[PDB]
Amino acid sequence: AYTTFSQTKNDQLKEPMFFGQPVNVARYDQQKYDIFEKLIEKQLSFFWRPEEVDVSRDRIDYQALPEHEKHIFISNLKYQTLLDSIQGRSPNVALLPLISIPELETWVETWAFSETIHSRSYTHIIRNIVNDPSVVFDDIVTNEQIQKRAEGISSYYDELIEMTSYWHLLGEGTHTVNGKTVTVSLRELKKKLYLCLMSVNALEAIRFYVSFACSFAFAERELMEGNAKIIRLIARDEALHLTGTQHMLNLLRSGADDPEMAEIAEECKQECYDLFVQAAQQEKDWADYLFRDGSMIGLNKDILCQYVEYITNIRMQAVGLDLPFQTRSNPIPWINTWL
Amino acid sequence: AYTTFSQTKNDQLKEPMFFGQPVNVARYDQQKYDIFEKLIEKQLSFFWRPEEVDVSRDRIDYQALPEHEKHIFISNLKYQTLLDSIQGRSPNVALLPLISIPELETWVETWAFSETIHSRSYTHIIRNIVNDPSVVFDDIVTNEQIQKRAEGISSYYDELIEMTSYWHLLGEGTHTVNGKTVTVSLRELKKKLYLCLMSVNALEAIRFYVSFACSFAFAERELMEGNAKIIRLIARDEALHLTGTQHMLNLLRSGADDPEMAEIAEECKQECYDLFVQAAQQEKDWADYLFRDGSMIGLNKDILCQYVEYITNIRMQAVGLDLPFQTRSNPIPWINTWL
Ligand SMILES: [Fe+3]
Ligand SMILES: [Fe+3]
Ligand SMILES: [Fe+3]
Ligand SMILES: [Fe+3]
Ligand SMILES: [Hg+2]
Ligand SMILES: [Hg+2]
Ligand SMILES: [Hg+2]
Ligand SMILES: [Hg+2]
Ligand SMILES: [Hg+2]
Ligand SMILES: [Hg+2]
Ligand SMILES: [Hg+2]
Ligand SMILES: [Hg+2]
Ligand SMILES: [Hg+2]
Ligand SMILES: [Hg+2]
Ligand SMILES: [Hg+2]
């Protein structure tokens, strides 16, 4: 099945990104796809430490905020914390067992590691703005609106992990387990990986960017500036993360890496399109919870729905999907200052 | 049955280190065991970029070494590369799916990430001292003596991963899989995890230190200074890695974590002892291959064997095991200069 060191001498430049021979030697002198080595290098060059960021005035700014604005700020922060709690562990548990080229294996571990720094930075902000961090952290697990917004993220990863385990343990075929038939299909597993990767692309390229707009709207008012510095560093990493999944996805659909993946991508076009639209819809719906007690200068439900549509169109076009929304200019040009 | 975001609001201070509820929120404001938070902080404080190290003179030094010394140097470097290729991926694929406290989850992902930096450093050295790095990397996979020295490392992680997949898919019990009766015992899986940790302790605390001694024998000669700087950085990280497994193991033994793990540590102590004795013998057996073309002043089979016994006793005492070897003073006190 899976092995931590395949003892067969293989040409790593000829393996597919996924489902080939597990990576044996970790070497970085050559790559099948140099984009992953470039991303590792850039991400290492961007290494930062959350505690090195001064967030000393954020507590008073937060206290002075009108209650509905405290609500907008903390709800957004809790969602960011939820997403990166998932992103810290999931690329490793879900992708590493399936990767067959070294540069992509190490990119995934570097990416996941950088997510743990993001999680540490959210703890740094939370500890410096509320008296008791535990209230904030526990609300993340059970918050109904947060889970509604992130609904389906852990399920894609979880289903891919389960199917990967069946494939590694039993291989392809029609099997039986305790009186039940269990069918294992590599094609279906490739489809699950493709859709999980598309979901991860929507997560980092759309969901987090909507959250960045919220955070930076405060920075525009010269408030929560410690948080702003941290989100700026996080967004700089996120740009690398979404670049990585865009390249994975485009290499999978072009047919240049795995012909079967190309057929899959085509067969999955409609499903993928609607999943992206569903993610956008979940982000829009979050607006009713976010602005339940009123809006803020530079940020309201309508400007956010417009930004969600703007960014979704850009991201979908980048991975070859049709645009679901009417084309428009960036509704919040000021955000470019921060990204 | 594994999930990337467990939906139950649990008190993370009361979960066992392993086999409890998978970690949902990644928070760092509190810890069941602060030693793992301190290790994360120390490892982040040591962050280093391999490519920045000047290895421009190592090529001149290496090409001018007598052939047998080239053999000693490169055989040692190839073994280091093998071990960290395994260490880069294995803590994430084998341990991460079993961790139930956030500070340990993030420590494992940071530890694994730091190992990919070690691998990157071996590529930096190799590509700058030989003309065809591929011959070196391919030999790591096919070299009989290198694989004999490492025998049992990958297979142990692999067996743990397989048993973990059966547990996550089927749960405890006696099952019928393709007409075969398969027993899934959580106690047996705990024993496998426990002994995997003991094996990883021997790997980083003994096997890598014997290799560091070989590398530093060249630094004592005022040669391979780029390599020397890198191995010094690697050893500083390795000290944190073995500290982490010593604490995981000693906390389990104490009975202050999962009580079943304290029972297992006592019941399995002869197996703990046996795996250290076997690893020490593999490290000694390597000397015949390492010095097949001749030895060096101050570095030969006898000296290597004395050091293996010396360091093995120190590491076994640190986790509560009886000493297999006669007591002796350090046979290579010059190594302290470098560590
Ligand atoms: Fe992130
Ligand atoms: Fe990210
Ligand atoms: Fe290492
Ligand atoms: Fe290590
Ligand atoms: Hg994914
Ligand atoms: Hg996913
Ligand atoms: Hg927002
Ligand atoms: Hg927003
Ligand atoms: Hg598609
Ligand atoms: Hg999609
Ligand atoms: Hg809209
Ligand atoms: Hg192990
Ligand atoms: Hg040695
Ligand atoms: Hg033991
Ligand atoms: Hg000896």
Domain harbouring A49, CATH code: 1.10.620.20
3-class secondary-structure state, position A288? helix
Contact, B22 vs B3, CB < 8 A? yes
Euclidean distance between CA atoms B91 and A174, whole angstroms? 32
Residue in this structure with the two tokens 């992509």, named with its chain if needed: A104
What's the order of all strands across the beta sheet hosting B180-184?
A180-184, A173-177, B173-177, B180-184
Flag whether B172 is marked binding: no
Q: Residues of B numbered 125-184 whose beta carbons fall under 8 angstroms of chain A's beta carbons: which are they?
A: 126-127, 133-134, 137-138, 140-142, 147, 153-154, 157-158, 161-162, 165-166, 168-170, 175-179
3-class secondary-structure state, position B299? strand
**Per the structure block, which two tokens stand in for B36?**
């793992």
Euclidean distance between CA atoms B23 and B109, whole angstroms? 13
Using alpha carbons, select from A80, A86, A204, A91 the residue that is nearest to residue A153.
Answer: A86
DSSP string, A50-115: GGGS--TTHHHHHHHS-HHHHHHHHHHHHHHHHHHHHHHHHIIIIIGGGB-SHHHHHHHHHHHHHH
CB under 8 Å to B159, separation ≥6 — which residues?
B192
Euclidean distance between CA atoms B164 and A134, whole angstroms? 31
**Per the structure block, which two tokens stand in for A136?**
């904030």
Count of domains observed in chain B:
1
Strand pairing category for A180-184 and B180-184: unpaired
DSSP string, B111-127: HHHHHHHHHHHHHHHHH
Contact, B194 vs B313, CB < 8 A? no
Give yes or no for A29 touching B (CB within 8 A).
yes
Query: Number of A:B CB contacts under 8 A?
Result: 205
Euclidean distance between CA atoms A18 and A25, whole angstroms? 16
Does B310 participate in catalysis according to the annotation?
Answer: no
Domain containing B202 equals 1-339
Euclidean distance between CA atoms A149 and B229, whole angstroms? 49
Q: Is the dihedral of CA A208, A209, A212, A213 positive or negative?
A: negative
Set of chain B residues whose Cβ sits within 8 Å of the Cβ of A44: 49, 117
- Which helix (H) or strand (E) segment holds residue A177: the answer is strand A173-177
Q: Strands, DSSP E only, in chain B? A: 173-177, 180-184
**φ, ψ of residue A118 in degrees (nearest 5):** -60, -45
For A334, which DSSP code?
G
Euclidean distance between CA atoms B97 and B10, whole angstroms? 17
Query: CA dist B107 to A117, A218, B101, B233, B243, Å?
Result: 11, 33, 10, 19, 12
> What was the structure determination method?
X-ray
Print the SS3 string covering chain B.
CCCCCCCCCCCCCCCCCECCCCCCCCCCCCCCCHHHHHHHHHHHHCCCCHHHCCCCCHHHHHHCCCHHHHHHHHHHHHHHHHHHHHHHHHHHHHHHHHECCHHHHHHHHHHHHHHHHHHHHHHHHHHCCCCCHHHHHHHHHHCHHHHHHHCCHHHHHHHHHHHHHHHHHHCCEEEEECCEEEEECHHHHHHHHHHHHHHHHHHHHHHHHHHHHHHHHHHCCCCCHHHHHHHHHHHHHHHHHHHHHHHHHHHHHHCCCCHHHHHHHHHCHHHHHHHHHHHHHHHHHHHHHHCCCCCECCECHHHHHHHHHHHHHHHHHHCCCCCCCCCCCCCCHHHHHCC
Distance A305 CA to ligand 11 centre (A): 4
Cβ–Cβ of B89/A105 closer than 8 Å?
A: yes
Task: Specify the resolution in Å.
Answer: 1.4
**Per the structure block, which two tokens stand in for B195?**
């002994």
**Per the structure block, which two tokens stand in for A244?**
């990585």
Torsion of CA A98, A102, A103, A107, to 10 degrees: 50
Flag whether B267 is marked binding: no
Q: Is the dihedral of CA A52, A54, A59, A61 positive or negative?
A: negative
Largest Cα separation within chain A, whole Å, is 64
Contact, B62 vs B125, CB < 8 A? no
Set of chain B residues whose Cβ sits within 8 Å of the Cβ of A192: none
Strand pairing category for A173-177 and A180-184: antiparallel
Set of chain B residues whose Cβ sits within 8 Å of the Cβ of A169: 162, 165-166, 169
Distance A40 CA to ligand 2 centre (A): 13
Distance A57 CA to ligand 11 centre (A): 35
Give yes or no for A2 touching B (CB within 8 A).
yes
Query: CA dist A134 to A72, A140, B10, Å?
Result: 19, 10, 12
- Beta-carbon count within 10 A of A222 CB: 9
Using alpha carbons, select from A71, A30, A98, A90 the residue that is nearest to residue A296.
Answer: A71
Euclidean distance between CA atoms A182 and A238, whole angstroms? 38
- Which helix (H) or strand (E) segment holds residue B169: the answer is helix B153-170
Q: How far is B298 from chain A, CA to nearest CA, in Å?
A: 31
Give yes or no for B334 touching A (CB within 8 A).
no
Query: CA dist A176 to A168, A182, A189, B120, B139, Å?
Result: 15, 6, 18, 44, 41
**Per the structure block, which two tokens stand in for A38?**
């470039």
Contact, B15 vs B100, CB < 8 A? yes
Q: How far is A331 from chain B, CA to nearest CA, in Å?
A: 33
